[PDB]
Amino acid sequence: PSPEILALRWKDTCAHYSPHEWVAARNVVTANKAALADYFYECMLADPNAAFFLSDQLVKTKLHAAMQDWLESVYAAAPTEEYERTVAFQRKVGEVHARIDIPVHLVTRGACALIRRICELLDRDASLSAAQAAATCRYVADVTMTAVEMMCHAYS
Amino acid sequence: PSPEILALRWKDTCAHYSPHEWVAARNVVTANKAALADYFYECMLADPNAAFFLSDQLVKTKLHAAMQDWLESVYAAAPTEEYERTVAFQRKVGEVHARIDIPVHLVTRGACALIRRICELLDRDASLSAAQAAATCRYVADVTMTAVEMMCHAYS
Ligand code: HEM
Ligand code: HEM
Ligand SMILES: [C-]#N
Ligand SMILES: [C-]#N
């Protein structure tokens, strides 16, 4: 299952939306990427079953920054047309988790935390119309879940 | 990992929203459950990797109806306070998929199809304010992903 094939799925998912959704989403994510990373590790480190796989040092020195870079990569893909590069990266991230047996149910819960908080931030974005915010939230759920799908290829 | 423990997670997720979000979501889902099932199997049977696991007869005679019942169960849980019953059901559904080795990445893509189409339907619901529709879409993503999390427990 090659990256140029997986890139079609990413391109097709994003093509359901306009560049306006891509930009609105990428703007809220870049403006809040540290706060989104904070919320992700706040949610995970609180569950003892998730904390099992995480050290405070690993989060502080590596993963907190990596999560910000992951978010930027996901939301840069469609605007910069870097589909093949992004899907290739998602596949490798998935392989990292599968190799150390991160329970897939915690990966999906993590994805949900990011989708929820990004869509909460979009709802409060005064620069978007009701219709534009709505379309952007649908894109955020779609593109995040596409990234999660690529990551979850490693688990089969 | 008992059902009364898993029920806390479902209750907590739904408690982030008001009964207004629960009802708006349950109303759009019940009104469109057959059309949502249609869209789910339209998306899956189109991918040859997913069609591998599905016969037209299995979809026509069992799963199409089961998907409608799954949707009704997910959106009935918070309004009827049947948390323990719903999480118990989700766990068993997950076990069905894990036993016949349904790739988890296809389960997540399926969940995304339902979230996308339900939120598309909510956007067009003239009876909801912009703010109410927004809150309801966030609930739909959260509660669907909670159901998916419960299903994915079987894969670890
Ligand atoms: C949406 C969900 C997730 C995303 C986007 C994500 C992101 C990432 C990324 C980008 C890396 C690679 C870091 C690097 O090598 O630069 C990574 C690795 C890792 N992730 Fe996640 N992750 C997710 C879910 C989880 C969950 C649920 C856990 C644990 C409960 C977890 C624990 C880890 C661990 C332990 C590593 C390896 C760190 C190291 O030892 O190199 N991740 N993750
Ligand atoms: C959100 C995702 C999904 C939901 C909500 C869901 C729902 C269900 C439910 C409720 C059942 C139990 C039916 C019964 O015993 O009454 C079931 C079984 C089954 N599902 Fe799914 N499913 C999902 C994803 C998938 C995917 C991605 C595939 C395949 C590519 C798949 C294929 C099957 C098969 C083959 C069975 C067993 C049917 C039988 O032989 O008894 N499902 N699913
Ligand atoms: C992965 N943090
Ligand atoms: C499962 N259809």
Short mmCIF file of all heavy atoms in Angstrom, two decimals, chain A residues 6 9 104 108 145-146 148-156, chain B residues 40-41 43-54 67 97 100-114 116 148 151-152 155:
data_model
loop_
_atom_site.label_atom_id
_atom_site.label_comp_id
_atom_site.label_asym_id
_atom_site.label_seq_id
_atom_site.Cartn_x
_atom_site.Cartn_y
_atom_site.Cartn_z
N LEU A 6 -2.14 6.14 -1.03
CA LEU A 6 -2.68 6.72 0.23
C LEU A 6 -2.91 8.23 0.04
O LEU A 6 -3.89 8.74 0.62
CB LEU A 6 -1.70 6.45 1.38
CG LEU A 6 -1.63 5.00 1.86
CD1 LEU A 6 -0.66 4.88 3.03
CD2 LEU A 6 -3.00 4.48 2.24
N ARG A 9 -6.38 9.25 -1.22
CA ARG A 9 -7.41 9.25 -0.14
C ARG A 9 -7.38 10.61 0.57
O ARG A 9 -8.47 11.18 0.79
CB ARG A 9 -7.17 8.11 0.85
CG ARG A 9 -8.25 8.00 1.93
CD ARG A 9 -8.32 6.63 2.56
NE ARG A 9 -8.60 5.59 1.57
CZ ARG A 9 -9.80 5.32 1.06
NH1 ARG A 9 -10.87 6.01 1.44
NH2 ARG A 9 -9.93 4.35 0.18
N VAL A 104 -4.75 0.93 20.37
CA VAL A 104 -5.33 1.75 19.27
C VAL A 104 -6.50 2.58 19.82
O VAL A 104 -6.69 3.71 19.32
CB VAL A 104 -5.75 0.90 18.05
CG1 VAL A 104 -6.85 -0.09 18.38
CG2 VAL A 104 -6.15 1.78 16.87
N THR A 108 -7.28 6.70 19.08
CA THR A 108 -8.59 7.26 18.62
C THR A 108 -9.09 8.30 19.64
O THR A 108 -9.56 9.36 19.21
CB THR A 108 -9.63 6.16 18.34
OG1 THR A 108 -9.99 5.53 19.57
CG2 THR A 108 -9.13 5.13 17.35
N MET A 145 -9.25 12.43 11.10
CA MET A 145 -9.62 10.99 11.04
C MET A 145 -8.89 10.30 9.88
O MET A 145 -8.57 9.11 10.04
CB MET A 145 -11.13 10.81 10.90
CG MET A 145 -11.88 11.06 12.19
SD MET A 145 -11.25 10.06 13.56
CE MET A 145 -12.00 8.48 13.18
N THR A 146 -8.62 11.01 8.78
CA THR A 146 -7.80 10.48 7.65
C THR A 146 -6.38 10.21 8.16
O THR A 146 -5.87 9.12 7.89
CB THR A 146 -7.80 11.42 6.44
OG1 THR A 146 -9.14 11.54 5.98
CG2 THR A 146 -6.92 10.92 5.32
N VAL A 148 -5.47 9.69 11.27
CA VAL A 148 -5.64 8.55 12.23
C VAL A 148 -5.72 7.24 11.44
O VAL A 148 -5.09 6.25 11.88
CB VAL A 148 -6.88 8.74 13.11
CG1 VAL A 148 -7.21 7.48 13.91
CG2 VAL A 148 -6.73 9.93 14.04
N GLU A 149 -6.46 7.22 10.33
CA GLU A 149 -6.61 6.02 9.47
C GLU A 149 -5.22 5.58 8.99
O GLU A 149 -4.91 4.38 9.11
CB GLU A 149 -7.54 6.29 8.28
CG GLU A 149 -7.74 5.08 7.40
CD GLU A 149 -8.54 5.34 6.14
OE1 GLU A 149 -9.51 6.11 6.21
OE2 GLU A 149 -8.19 4.76 5.09
N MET A 150 -4.42 6.53 8.48
CA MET A 150 -3.05 6.28 7.94
C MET A 150 -2.18 5.69 9.07
O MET A 150 -1.48 4.70 8.81
CB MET A 150 -2.39 7.56 7.43
CG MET A 150 -3.17 8.29 6.34
SD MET A 150 -3.24 7.39 4.78
CE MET A 150 -4.35 8.44 3.84
N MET A 151 -2.25 6.29 10.26
CA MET A 151 -1.52 5.83 11.47
C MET A 151 -1.96 4.40 11.82
O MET A 151 -1.09 3.61 12.22
CB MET A 151 -1.79 6.75 12.66
CG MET A 151 -1.11 8.10 12.55
SD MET A 151 -1.59 9.25 13.86
CE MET A 151 -1.07 8.34 15.31
N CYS A 152 -3.24 4.07 11.67
CA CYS A 152 -3.83 2.79 12.14
C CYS A 152 -3.54 1.64 11.15
O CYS A 152 -3.76 0.48 11.54
CB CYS A 152 -5.32 2.92 12.39
SG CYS A 152 -5.68 3.79 13.94
N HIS A 153 -3.05 1.94 9.94
CA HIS A 153 -2.59 0.93 8.94
C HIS A 153 -1.56 0.00 9.58
O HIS A 153 -1.55 -1.20 9.23
CB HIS A 153 -2.04 1.61 7.68
CG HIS A 153 -3.05 1.76 6.58
ND1 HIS A 153 -3.78 2.92 6.42
CD2 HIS A 153 -3.44 0.92 5.61
CE1 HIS A 153 -4.59 2.78 5.38
NE2 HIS A 153 -4.40 1.56 4.87
N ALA A 154 -0.73 0.52 10.50
CA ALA A 154 0.35 -0.21 11.19
C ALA A 154 -0.21 -1.34 12.08
O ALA A 154 0.55 -2.28 12.36
CB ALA A 154 1.18 0.76 12.00
N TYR A 155 -1.47 -1.25 12.50
CA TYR A 155 -2.08 -2.15 13.52
C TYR A 155 -2.66 -3.42 12.88
O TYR A 155 -3.02 -4.34 13.64
CB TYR A 155 -3.16 -1.41 14.32
CG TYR A 155 -2.61 -0.50 15.39
CD1 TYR A 155 -2.45 0.86 15.16
CD2 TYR A 155 -2.23 -0.99 16.63
CE1 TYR A 155 -1.94 1.70 16.13
CE2 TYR A 155 -1.72 -0.16 17.61
CZ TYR A 155 -1.57 1.19 17.36
OH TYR A 155 -1.07 2.02 18.32
N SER A 156 -2.75 -3.49 11.54
CA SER A 156 -3.32 -4.65 10.80
C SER A 156 -2.20 -5.49 10.20
O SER A 156 -1.21 -4.96 9.69
CB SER A 156 -4.30 -4.19 9.75
OG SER A 156 -3.69 -3.28 8.85
N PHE B 40 -22.95 4.59 4.62
CA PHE B 40 -21.89 3.77 5.25
C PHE B 40 -21.49 2.63 4.31
O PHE B 40 -20.28 2.47 4.05
CB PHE B 40 -22.35 3.26 6.62
CG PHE B 40 -21.34 2.39 7.33
CD1 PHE B 40 -20.47 2.93 8.26
CD2 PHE B 40 -21.27 1.03 7.07
CE1 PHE B 40 -19.55 2.13 8.92
CE2 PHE B 40 -20.35 0.23 7.72
CZ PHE B 40 -19.49 0.78 8.64
N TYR B 41 -22.46 1.87 3.79
CA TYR B 41 -22.21 0.66 2.95
C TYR B 41 -21.89 1.08 1.51
O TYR B 41 -21.16 0.33 0.84
CB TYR B 41 -23.37 -0.33 3.08
CG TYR B 41 -23.46 -0.88 4.47
CD1 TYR B 41 -24.44 -0.46 5.35
CD2 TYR B 41 -22.48 -1.74 4.95
CE1 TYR B 41 -24.49 -0.92 6.65
CE2 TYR B 41 -22.52 -2.21 6.25
CZ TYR B 41 -23.52 -1.80 7.11
OH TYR B 41 -23.57 -2.24 8.39
N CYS B 43 -19.96 3.70 0.90
CA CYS B 43 -18.53 4.06 1.10
C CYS B 43 -17.67 2.79 1.21
O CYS B 43 -16.59 2.76 0.58
CB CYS B 43 -18.34 4.94 2.33
SG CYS B 43 -19.01 6.61 2.12
N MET B 44 -18.11 1.80 1.99
CA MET B 44 -17.33 0.57 2.30
C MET B 44 -17.26 -0.34 1.06
O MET B 44 -16.13 -0.73 0.69
CB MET B 44 -17.93 -0.21 3.47
CG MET B 44 -17.64 0.40 4.82
SD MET B 44 -15.87 0.42 5.21
CE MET B 44 -15.84 1.76 6.40
N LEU B 45 -18.40 -0.68 0.46
CA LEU B 45 -18.50 -1.65 -0.67
C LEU B 45 -17.76 -1.11 -1.90
O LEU B 45 -17.49 -1.93 -2.81
CB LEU B 45 -19.98 -1.92 -0.99
CG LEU B 45 -20.74 -2.73 0.06
CD1 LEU B 45 -22.24 -2.69 -0.21
CD2 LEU B 45 -20.25 -4.17 0.11
N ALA B 46 -17.45 0.19 -1.94
CA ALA B 46 -16.70 0.87 -3.03
C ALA B 46 -15.20 0.58 -2.92
O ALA B 46 -14.54 0.53 -3.98
CB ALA B 46 -16.97 2.35 -3.00
N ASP B 47 -14.67 0.43 -1.70
CA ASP B 47 -13.25 0.06 -1.43
C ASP B 47 -13.12 -1.45 -1.53
O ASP B 47 -13.74 -2.17 -0.74
CB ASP B 47 -12.78 0.57 -0.07
CG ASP B 47 -11.34 0.22 0.27
OD1 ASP B 47 -10.68 -0.45 -0.54
OD2 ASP B 47 -10.88 0.63 1.36
N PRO B 48 -12.31 -1.99 -2.47
CA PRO B 48 -12.15 -3.45 -2.59
C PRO B 48 -11.59 -4.11 -1.32
O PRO B 48 -11.95 -5.25 -1.07
CB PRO B 48 -11.20 -3.63 -3.79
CG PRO B 48 -10.52 -2.28 -3.96
CD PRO B 48 -11.52 -1.26 -3.46
N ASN B 49 -10.76 -3.40 -0.55
CA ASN B 49 -10.14 -3.91 0.71
C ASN B 49 -11.21 -4.11 1.79
O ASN B 49 -11.04 -5.04 2.61
CB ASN B 49 -9.04 -2.97 1.22
CG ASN B 49 -7.87 -2.88 0.27
OD1 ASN B 49 -7.34 -3.89 -0.18
ND2 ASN B 49 -7.45 -1.66 -0.04
N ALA B 50 -12.25 -3.28 1.81
CA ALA B 50 -13.39 -3.38 2.75
C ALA B 50 -14.40 -4.42 2.24
O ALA B 50 -14.86 -5.24 3.06
CB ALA B 50 -14.05 -2.03 2.92
N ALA B 51 -14.71 -4.40 0.94
CA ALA B 51 -15.66 -5.32 0.27
C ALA B 51 -15.24 -6.78 0.48
O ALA B 51 -16.12 -7.66 0.48
CB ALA B 51 -15.76 -4.99 -1.20
N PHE B 52 -13.94 -7.02 0.67
CA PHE B 52 -13.33 -8.33 1.02
C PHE B 52 -14.11 -9.01 2.15
O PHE B 52 -14.29 -10.24 2.11
CB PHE B 52 -11.86 -8.14 1.42
CG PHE B 52 -11.11 -9.41 1.71
CD1 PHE B 52 -10.51 -10.13 0.68
CD2 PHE B 52 -10.98 -9.88 3.01
CE1 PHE B 52 -9.81 -11.30 0.95
CE2 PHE B 52 -10.28 -11.05 3.27
CZ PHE B 52 -9.69 -11.75 2.25
N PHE B 53 -14.56 -8.22 3.14
CA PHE B 53 -15.15 -8.70 4.41
C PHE B 53 -16.69 -8.71 4.34
O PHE B 53 -17.31 -9.21 5.29
CB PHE B 53 -14.68 -7.81 5.57
CG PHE B 53 -13.19 -7.81 5.77
CD1 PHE B 53 -12.39 -6.82 5.22
CD2 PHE B 53 -12.58 -8.82 6.50
CE1 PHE B 53 -11.02 -6.83 5.40
CE2 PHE B 53 -11.20 -8.83 6.69
CZ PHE B 53 -10.43 -7.83 6.14
N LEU B 54 -17.27 -8.17 3.27
CA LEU B 54 -18.73 -7.95 3.14
C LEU B 54 -19.27 -8.67 1.91
O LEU B 54 -18.65 -8.56 0.83
CB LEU B 54 -18.99 -6.44 3.05
CG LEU B 54 -18.56 -5.63 4.27
CD1 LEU B 54 -18.65 -4.13 3.99
CD2 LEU B 54 -19.39 -5.99 5.49
N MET B 67 -26.76 -1.64 11.58
CA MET B 67 -26.14 -0.29 11.57
C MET B 67 -27.18 0.74 12.05
O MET B 67 -26.81 1.62 12.85
CB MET B 67 -25.63 0.09 10.18
CG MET B 67 -24.96 1.46 10.12
SD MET B 67 -23.59 1.65 11.30
CE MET B 67 -22.40 0.49 10.61
N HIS B 97 -15.71 -7.79 15.39
CA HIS B 97 -14.79 -7.27 14.34
C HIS B 97 -13.38 -7.82 14.55
O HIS B 97 -12.76 -8.25 13.55
CB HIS B 97 -14.80 -5.74 14.31
CG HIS B 97 -16.10 -5.18 13.84
ND1 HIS B 97 -17.07 -4.75 14.72
CD2 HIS B 97 -16.60 -4.99 12.61
CE1 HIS B 97 -18.11 -4.31 14.04
NE2 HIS B 97 -17.84 -4.44 12.74
N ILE B 100 -12.78 -11.66 13.54
CA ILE B 100 -12.70 -11.92 12.07
C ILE B 100 -11.66 -10.99 11.43
O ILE B 100 -11.58 -10.97 10.19
CB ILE B 100 -14.08 -11.83 11.39
CG1 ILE B 100 -14.67 -10.42 11.44
CG2 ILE B 100 -15.03 -12.86 11.98
CD1 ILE B 100 -16.03 -10.29 10.81
N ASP B 101 -10.90 -10.25 12.25
CA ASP B 101 -9.71 -9.45 11.86
C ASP B 101 -10.12 -8.36 10.86
O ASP B 101 -9.40 -8.18 9.86
CB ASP B 101 -8.59 -10.33 11.30
CG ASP B 101 -8.06 -11.35 12.29
OD1 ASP B 101 -7.75 -10.94 13.43
OD2 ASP B 101 -7.96 -12.53 11.92
N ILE B 102 -11.22 -7.65 11.13
CA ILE B 102 -11.57 -6.40 10.40
C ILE B 102 -10.46 -5.39 10.72
O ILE B 102 -10.22 -5.11 11.89
CB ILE B 102 -12.96 -5.86 10.80
CG1 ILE B 102 -14.08 -6.88 10.55
CG2 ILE B 102 -13.25 -4.54 10.11
CD1 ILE B 102 -14.16 -7.38 9.13
N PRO B 103 -9.73 -4.87 9.71
CA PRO B 103 -8.69 -3.87 9.95
C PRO B 103 -9.27 -2.65 10.68
O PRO B 103 -10.25 -2.10 10.21
CB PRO B 103 -8.19 -3.50 8.55
CG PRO B 103 -8.54 -4.71 7.70
CD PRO B 103 -9.83 -5.24 8.28
N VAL B 104 -8.67 -2.28 11.82
CA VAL B 104 -9.19 -1.19 12.70
C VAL B 104 -9.24 0.13 11.91
O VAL B 104 -10.15 0.93 12.19
CB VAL B 104 -8.36 -1.05 14.00
CG1 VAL B 104 -6.92 -0.66 13.74
CG2 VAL B 104 -9.02 -0.08 14.97
N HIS B 105 -8.34 0.35 10.95
CA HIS B 105 -8.29 1.59 10.13
C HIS B 105 -9.60 1.74 9.34
O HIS B 105 -9.99 2.89 9.08
CB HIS B 105 -7.03 1.65 9.25
CG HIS B 105 -7.10 0.89 7.97
ND1 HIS B 105 -6.53 -0.35 7.82
CD2 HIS B 105 -7.65 1.21 6.78
CE1 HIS B 105 -6.73 -0.78 6.59
NE2 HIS B 105 -7.41 0.16 5.93
N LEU B 106 -10.26 0.64 8.99
CA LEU B 106 -11.55 0.66 8.24
C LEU B 106 -12.70 0.97 9.20
O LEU B 106 -13.66 1.64 8.77
CB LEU B 106 -11.76 -0.67 7.51
CG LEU B 106 -10.78 -0.96 6.37
CD1 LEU B 106 -11.06 -2.32 5.75
CD2 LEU B 106 -10.85 0.13 5.31
N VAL B 107 -12.62 0.51 10.46
CA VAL B 107 -13.61 0.83 11.52
C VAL B 107 -13.61 2.35 11.74
O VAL B 107 -14.70 2.95 11.77
CB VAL B 107 -13.34 0.06 12.83
CG1 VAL B 107 -14.27 0.51 13.95
CG2 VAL B 107 -13.42 -1.44 12.63
N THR B 108 -12.42 2.96 11.87
CA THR B 108 -12.27 4.42 12.09
C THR B 108 -12.80 5.19 10.87
O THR B 108 -13.50 6.19 11.07
CB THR B 108 -10.83 4.81 12.45
OG1 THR B 108 -9.99 4.61 11.32
CG2 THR B 108 -10.29 4.05 13.65
N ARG B 109 -12.49 4.73 9.65
CA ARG B 109 -12.98 5.38 8.40
C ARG B 109 -14.51 5.33 8.36
O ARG B 109 -15.12 6.34 7.96
CB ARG B 109 -12.41 4.72 7.14
CG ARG B 109 -12.79 5.44 5.85
CD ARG B 109 -12.62 4.58 4.62
NE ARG B 109 -11.23 4.20 4.43
CZ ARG B 109 -10.80 3.27 3.58
NH1 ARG B 109 -11.66 2.60 2.82
NH2 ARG B 109 -9.51 2.99 3.50
N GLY B 110 -15.09 4.19 8.74
CA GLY B 110 -16.55 4.00 8.84
C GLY B 110 -17.17 4.99 9.81
O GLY B 110 -18.17 5.63 9.45
N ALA B 111 -16.57 5.13 11.00
CA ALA B 111 -17.01 6.08 12.05
C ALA B 111 -16.99 7.50 11.49
O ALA B 111 -17.95 8.25 11.75
CB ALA B 111 -16.12 5.96 13.26
N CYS B 112 -15.94 7.85 10.74
CA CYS B 112 -15.76 9.19 10.12
C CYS B 112 -16.89 9.46 9.13
O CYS B 112 -17.40 10.60 9.12
CB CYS B 112 -14.41 9.29 9.43
SG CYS B 112 -14.16 10.90 8.64
N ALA B 113 -17.27 8.47 8.32
CA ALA B 113 -18.36 8.57 7.32
C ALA B 113 -19.66 8.96 8.02
O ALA B 113 -20.35 9.89 7.54
CB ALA B 113 -18.51 7.26 6.57
N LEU B 114 -19.97 8.29 9.13
CA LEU B 114 -21.19 8.55 9.94
C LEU B 114 -21.12 9.96 10.54
O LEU B 114 -22.12 10.69 10.42
CB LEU B 114 -21.33 7.49 11.03
CG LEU B 114 -21.57 6.06 10.54
CD1 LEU B 114 -21.46 5.08 11.69
CD2 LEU B 114 -22.93 5.94 9.85
N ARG B 116 -19.29 12.62 9.58
CA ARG B 116 -19.35 13.59 8.45
C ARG B 116 -20.81 13.76 8.01
O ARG B 116 -21.28 14.90 7.96
CB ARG B 116 -18.48 13.11 7.28
CG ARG B 116 -18.63 13.96 6.03
CD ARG B 116 -17.67 13.56 4.92
NE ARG B 116 -17.84 12.18 4.49
CZ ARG B 116 -17.00 11.18 4.73
NH1 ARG B 116 -15.89 11.36 5.43
NH2 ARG B 116 -17.28 9.97 4.27
N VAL B 148 -16.65 4.20 19.20
CA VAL B 148 -15.50 3.63 18.43
C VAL B 148 -14.42 3.18 19.42
O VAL B 148 -13.86 2.08 19.22
CB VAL B 148 -14.93 4.63 17.41
CG1 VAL B 148 -13.62 4.15 16.81
CG2 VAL B 148 -15.94 4.94 16.31
N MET B 151 -15.51 -0.05 21.07
CA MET B 151 -15.37 -1.10 20.03
C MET B 151 -13.90 -1.50 19.89
O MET B 151 -13.63 -2.69 19.71
CB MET B 151 -15.90 -0.61 18.68
CG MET B 151 -17.42 -0.51 18.63
SD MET B 151 -18.02 0.25 17.10
CE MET B 151 -17.37 -0.89 15.88
N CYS B 152 -12.97 -0.54 19.96
CA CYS B 152 -11.53 -0.75 19.67
C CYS B 152 -10.80 -1.40 20.86
O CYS B 152 -9.65 -1.85 20.65
CB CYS B 152 -10.85 0.54 19.26
SG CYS B 152 -11.26 1.02 17.56
N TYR B 155 -9.26 -4.82 20.22
CA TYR B 155 -8.08 -4.91 19.32
C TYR B 155 -6.76 -4.94 20.10
O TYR B 155 -5.72 -5.22 19.48
CB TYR B 155 -8.08 -3.77 18.30
CG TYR B 155 -9.04 -3.97 17.15
CD1 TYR B 155 -10.30 -3.39 17.16
CD2 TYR B 155 -8.69 -4.74 16.06
CE1 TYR B 155 -11.19 -3.58 16.12
CE2 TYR B 155 -9.57 -4.93 15.00
CZ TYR B 155 -10.82 -4.35 15.03
OH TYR B 155 -11.69 -4.52 14.00
#
